[PDB]
């Protein structure tokens, strides 16, 4: 076997280069204003004072915040980032093959793992000992060869995140599931409909009738004293979000810790 | 006695030839577009853009999927197929006259039964020992003369399915009950009504009035902001389905297993 | 007996060639824009400002996400893919004929199975020992001849997925049920109805009346301040989805693990 | 197995069909025939109509509605009759039982 040092092919296979984590963008996951506009096919949002359509700056803003919302509704790291963690010694888990659970998941790869004292490395574990479970967020060692806890004894560096899926309809455990993309889209869309709902009619109008010289024109709009212009669409989007979240909260497990 | 070898007249009587399982078709069970159209007597479904009636390809598609639905709402095999199963040794059931429950039921006939090791037949049981209970899905042997389980010791081949009934108003245990036909029809019909409900009026219209020169024409349709054009028919079909399913889930028993 | 090496005819029969997993497409499973459009026979989705029909790219996008949703509502792998797993040693299950449960199911076939240490094969199990249960997702060995667990001792490679069914109305345990196709169609159709429900009528209009020179028209739409234009169809589709999911969650079993 | 048609009016031997089971089967058929007929009483999907032409005016409200089909009432009454008949017949035939 030959490999780039930390990336032992069995225990810690390389999945991404540290150059690419700066090159990946939201558009590479398909989160783009064009996608949102596709879900709003046949609708246009424009300023009634000017006819100017809504700018892509707002779409990208909403998309980035929707990504943040998805990364907090589920205890996951969506976008690749380098994580550096100082983790505590606990006797039970240290005896359990040096078990540590990462704060962020999935693990793309582990970059460093050391036992240290005041920042001095006390031991550097050979990379061929590292065992990684990517979707779980678990790291262990399987060596080839006065208190129950102590703070910040373990130094761990790794890359968390998800890669864009390689094939249609499929994902590896380190690849973003196709439906989490749609969840993020639904979160963005729920904001865009709240903006659009103000502009279907003049402000605050539920009904109008206008008549001149016996020509009569009359509108009842979807606005009402209770419900906003986009109420129904938002309710449907919330139902879809609920189904998607149930599915994804079955894919990622329940959090647990041993005291 | 004389018989075709596997089909001992008492324990495993022949009910179908293996040539016929390729010749049987949905139409032989009476599932045909004409039957659906008979239940929709006095209605026609046609494309308003062209006046073309709906093609029989769609009816046959819906019928085949409705058959699949019926085969999953009940734990049954409707259409004849050859099943090959590798079944585990369990000590209690093996001592219980070599009891095995087939995964699919009814049994039309058993084709092979052997005890084997790495695909080598260790023993071939004489066909005169085979005892079959067709509707239950049970097979047993009644010989004329370090662990509690082991995987895939038993090799079983059989035909599952149901034959079309020979007489009006009657069925043998290996014949399709007359009302399961109607259940499959009701499942197809529930889709056809959902298609038809879009075409009774122009899209999205609940009311119209049109008046020209004092001639007045006015319609209230069965569409509404809540209920679709075929709501009532679907509700009635669901009631009928519920009664039929209760009856058929009394005919086939509750599933049970001994741990 | 003669066979391609890993694919022992009894324990691990070959069901697909590894060349075909690249060639299979959504269309081979009957998921196509035309299969969606058939369920909306007599409707067209059309931009009211231009008359252009919606492009099939959106249909394909929605279908691919609907497949992802179906693969998360049920704990299954629909489309064929090659899975590589490193699985932990557990003493109880290792003693239980080397029982391992795959993370993904059904198994189409097992490609490799080895016990290893730092990537070195410690033993390679003869293919004639492999016992596979395809729909369950179980693998065992039946040999011909200091801690309770250890990480990643077992190396398992296999193909998960389902093949398109070979006969009408029937599926083998490794073949897709006909009703799961309809489930994926219904998931796509729910989104297409959400899009179309905005376009049946002028945006945000619940009632209109126009009177000009002795011509009068009044229209009430299915849109309302509470309900969107396609509310009814979506509700019925949700009922159908619920029935299908109950059936399929009876076909696949409840998940269980021994702690 | 089976039943013979009864030999006297109003009476059945234990091997003869009860008169009310005939009515039960009739009611089951009739429920389907009413489902068919309930689509045809009126133009399909019409709940209200009004027409005014040259001083002739007609308005009709039908039993069809966005909730209920045209034959809803008859089907409901037939379901009540079926329920009574089934209670009676499930008193005539007993509860099933087996010794394990």
């Amino acid at each position: 076997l030959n490999y780039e040092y930390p990336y032992h092919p069995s225990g810690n296979p390389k999945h991404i280069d540290v150059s690419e984590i700066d090159n990946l963008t939201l558009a590479d996951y398909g989160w783009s204003p064009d996608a949102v506009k596709a879900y709003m096919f046949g609708i246009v949002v424009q300023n009634p004072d000017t006819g100017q359509p809504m700018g892509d700056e707002f779409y990208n803003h909403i998309l980035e915040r929707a990504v943040g919302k998805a990364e907090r509704a589920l205890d996951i790291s969506i976008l690749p980032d380098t994580q550096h963690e100082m983790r505590d010694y606990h006797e039970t888990e240290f005896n359990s093959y040096m078990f540590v659970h990462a704060y962020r998941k999935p693990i793309l790869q582990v970059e460093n793992l050391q036992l240290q004292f005041n920042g001095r490395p006390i031991y550097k574990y050979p990379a061929n000992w590292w065992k990684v479970e990517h979707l779980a967020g678990h790291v262990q060692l399987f060596p080839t060869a006065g208190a129950t806890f102590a703070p910040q004894m373990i130094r761990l560096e790794y890359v968390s995140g998800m890669l864009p899926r390689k094939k249609a309809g499929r994902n590896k455990p380190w690849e973003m599931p196709p439906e989490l993309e749609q969840l993020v889209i639904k979160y963005a869309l729920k904001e865009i409909y709240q903006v659009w709902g103000n502009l279907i009619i003049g402000a605050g109008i539920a009904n109008k009738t206008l008549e001149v010289d016996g020509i009569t024109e009359t509108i009842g709009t979807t606005q009402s004293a209770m419900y906003g212009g986009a109420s129904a669409q938002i309710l449907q989007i919330n139902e879809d979000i609920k189904e998607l979240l149930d599915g994804l909260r079955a894919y990622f497990g329940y959090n647990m810790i041993g005291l | 006695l004389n018989y075709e070898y596997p089909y001992h007249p008492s324990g495993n009587p022949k009910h179908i030839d293996v040539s016929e399982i390729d010749n049987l078709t949905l139409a032989d069970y009476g599932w045909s577009p004409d039957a659906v159209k008979a239940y929709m007597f006095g209605i026609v479904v046609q494309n308003p853009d062209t006046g073309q009636p709906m093609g029989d390809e769609f009816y046959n598609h819906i019928l085949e999927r409705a058959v699949g639905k019926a085969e999953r709402a009940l734990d049954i095999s409707i259409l004849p197929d050859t099943q090959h199963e590798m079944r585990d040794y369990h000590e209690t059931e093996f001592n219980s006259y070599m009891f095995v429950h087939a995964y699919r039921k009814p049994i039309l006939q058993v084709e092979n039964l052997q005890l084997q090791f790495n695909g080598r037949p260790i023993y071939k049981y004489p066909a005169n020992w085979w005892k079959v209970e067709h509707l239950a899905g049970h097979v047993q042997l009644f010989p004329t003369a370090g662990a509690t389980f082991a995987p895939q010791m038993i090799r079983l081949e059989y035909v599952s399915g149901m034959l079309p009934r020979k007489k009006a108003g009657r069925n043998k245990p290996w014949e399709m009950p007359p009302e399961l036909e109607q259940l499959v029809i009701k499942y197809a019909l529930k889709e056809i009504y959902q298609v038809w409900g879009n075409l009774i009026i122009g899209a999205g219209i609940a009311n119209k009035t049109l008046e020209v020169d004092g001639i007045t024409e006015t319609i209230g349709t069965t569409q509404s902001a809540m209920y679709g054009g075929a709501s009532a028919q679907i509700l009635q079909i669901n009631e009928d389905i519920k009664e039929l399913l209760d009856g058929l889930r009394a005919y086939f028993g509750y599933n049970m297993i001994g741990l | 007996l003669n066979y391609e090496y890993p694919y022992h005819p009894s324990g691990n029969p070959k069901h697909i060639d590894v060349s075909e997993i690249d060639n299979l497409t959504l269309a081979d499973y009957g998921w196509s824009p035309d299969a969606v459009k058939a369920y909306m026979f007599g409707i067209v989705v059309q931009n009211p400002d231009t008359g252009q029909p919606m492009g099939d790219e959106f249909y394909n996008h929605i279908l691919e996400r609907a497949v992802g949703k179906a693969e998360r509502a049920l704990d299954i792998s629909i489309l064929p893919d090659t899975q590589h797993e490193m699985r932990d040693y557990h003493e109880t299950e290792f003693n239980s004929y080397m029982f391992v449960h795959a993370y993904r199911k059904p198994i189409l076939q097992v490609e490799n199975l080895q016990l290893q240490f730092n990537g070195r094969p410690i033993y390679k199990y003869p293919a004639n020992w492999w016992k596979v249960e395809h729909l369950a997702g179980h693998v065992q060995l039946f040999p011909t001849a200091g801690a309770t667990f250890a990480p990643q001792m077992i190396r398992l490679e296999y193909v998960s997925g389902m093949l398109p069914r070979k006969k009408a109305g029937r599926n083998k345990p490794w073949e897709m049920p006909p009703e799961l196709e309809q489930l994926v169609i219904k998931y796509a159709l729910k989104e297409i109805y959400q899009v179309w429900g905005n376009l049946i009528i002028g945006a945000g209009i619940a009632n209109k009346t126009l009177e000009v020179d002795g011509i009068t028209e009044t229209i009430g739409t299915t849109q309302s301040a509470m309900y969107g234009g396609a509310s009814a169809q979506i509700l019925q589709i949700n009922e159908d989805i619920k029935e299908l999911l109950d059936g399929l969650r009876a076909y696949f079993g409840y998940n269980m693990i021994g702690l | 197995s089976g039943m013979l048609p009864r030999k006297k009016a109003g009476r059945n031997k234990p091997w003869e069909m009860p008169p009310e089971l005939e009515q039960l089967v009739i009611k089951y058929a009739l429920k389907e025939i009413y489902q068919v007929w309930g689509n045809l009483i009126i133009g399909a999907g019409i709940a209200n109509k009004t027409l005014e032409v040259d001083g002739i005016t007609e308005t009709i409200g039908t039993t069809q509605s966005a909730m209920y089909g045209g034959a809803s009432a008859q089907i409901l009454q037939i379901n009540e009759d079926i329920k009574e008949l089934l209670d009676g017949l499930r008193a005539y035939f007993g509860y099933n039982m087996i010794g394990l």
Binding site: A168, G169 | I219 | - | G43
Partner: peptide, 20 residues
């Protein structure tokens, strides 16, 4: 391969009821 990402109904009088 790659993931896909970006009538007739007539009103008429009942003439028999008109005769009545």
């Amino acid at each position: 391969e790659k993931p896909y990402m970006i009538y007739t109904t007539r009103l008429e009088f009942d003439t028999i009821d008109m005769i009545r």
